[PDB]
């Protein structure tokens, strides 16, 4: 609040520009930090190891609990992966699922942005349309690069 | 002169220190706003009867302490730009920022489920 | 004489049950009527005409499409922004303002 109070107080539709600038800068900073981090090879090794561990543990949990579940319905190695490249063991329907969920989550950004900003006063309508489209495509491309 | 020029998208004039001093003395300055990261830039709006009509000047006020009484004496009304409405709008924005994370969580969950079962691929 | 008044007072108390349950059944009827529009033949006719409109609109706007998808950011706005940003930072020397850029 002190943050937003300061940028409202010190610097004709200017405060909204400053606030949008602040929020965009902050989100971009966090995203750039994360991408720059995972751009290191050993960190990719780290995340690959954690992924195979969590996959195996989820498999154990799944077997156990599904078996006890259809029992209640009755009532009523590591190296082959760890030494091979990532994409040859993972199917493509998984990434297609990830992409479909992402798309479905963010597919309403342009309309929300346009409605929020819009209530020579409406000579800015082309600018807000351009901004909506560009921002939506930025989100999609950031998914792509990550 | 004003008779040998074209009207072009009126801009903020510039006054140094004493034209503004004489203007606030003669009783023609109507309002002033302070701004700048260093709390010494002023945007001054004059009133109708003044020579030239209502216009907007920009002045840099060198630190002199007897300015305050000078302005307040001649009825100048010093102002800001933080009227209660923008404060309320800022608090509204902060509230939306507080809510944005759980709503995005529940939306991600709903769409994981809808992508999985309630609307899968046809075969 | 008795049974008729008894069934009448039960009629009235189940009318009470209905009064304490009016908004829920009302909004249920509302969402049912809403879901009723999007299963007619009218709605599939509409979807197919929308398809025709999208086909005609795609055939007349190939240049604008490629502009907004490939050119607008990557080759127009991003390099401008990057150069202006770099020159806003980066103190006023020559090794930093011209040579390393």
């Amino acid at each position: 609040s002190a943050i937003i109070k300061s940028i409202n107080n010190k610097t004709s539709s200017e405060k909204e520009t400053m606030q949008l600038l602040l929020m965009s800068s902050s989100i971009l900073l966090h995203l750039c930090a994360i991408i720059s981090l995972v751009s290191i090879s050993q960190v990719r090794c780290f995340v690959k190891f954690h992924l195979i561990l969590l996959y195996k543990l989820s498999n154990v949990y799944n077997a156990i609990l599904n078996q006890l579940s259809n029992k209640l319905q009755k009532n009523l190695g590591f190296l082959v992966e760890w030494s091979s490249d990532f994409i040859t063991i993972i199917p493509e329907n998984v990434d297609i699922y990830i992409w479909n969920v992402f798309s479905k989550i963010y597919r309403t950004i342009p309309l929300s942005f346009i409605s929020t900003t819009l209530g020579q006063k409406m000579v800015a309508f082309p600018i807000l349309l351009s901004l909506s489209h560009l921002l939506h495509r930025r989100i999609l491309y950031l998914f792509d690069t990550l | 002169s004003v008779k040998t020029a074209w009207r072009t998208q009126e801009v903020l004039r510039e006054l140094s220190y004493t034209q503004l001093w004489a203007l606030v003395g003669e009783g023609h300055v109507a309002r002033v706003r302070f701004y700048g990261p260093e709390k010494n830039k002023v945007m001054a709006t004059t009133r109708a009867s003044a020579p030239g009509g209502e216009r907007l000047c920009k002045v840099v006020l060198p630190p002199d302490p007897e300015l305050l009484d000078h302005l307040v004496s001649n009825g100048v009304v010093v102002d800001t730009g933080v009227t209660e409405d923008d404060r309320l709008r800022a608090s509204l924005l902060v509230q939306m920022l507080r809510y944005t994370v759980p709503f995005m969580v529940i939306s991600g969950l709903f769409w994981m489920i809808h992508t999985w079962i309630l609307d899968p691929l046809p075969n | 004489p008795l049974t008729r008044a008894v069934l009448a007072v039960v009629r009235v108390r189940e009318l009470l049950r209905a009064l304490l349950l009016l908004p829920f059944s009302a909004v249920g009827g509302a969402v049912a009527a809403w879901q009723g529009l999007f299963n007619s033949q009218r709605y599939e006719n509409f979807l197919m005409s929308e398809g025709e409109r999208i086909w005609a609109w795609r055939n007349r706007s190939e240049n604008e499409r490629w502009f907004w998808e490939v050119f607008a950011w990557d080759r127009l706005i991003f390099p401008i922004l990057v150069i202006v940003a770099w020159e806003y930072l980066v103190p006023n020397h020559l090794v930093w303002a011209v040579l390393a850029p």
């Binding site: 943050i3 300061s6 940028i7 010190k10 610097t11 400053m18 600038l21 900073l29 | 990261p37 | 930072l89």
Partner: peptide, 15 residues
């Protein structure tokens, strides 16, 4: 953030 820094810097009292 370098544009907003002179504005945000008043939360500490500095220039």
């Amino acid at each position: 953030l370098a544009l907003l820094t002179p504005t945000l810097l008043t939360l500490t009292g500095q220039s």
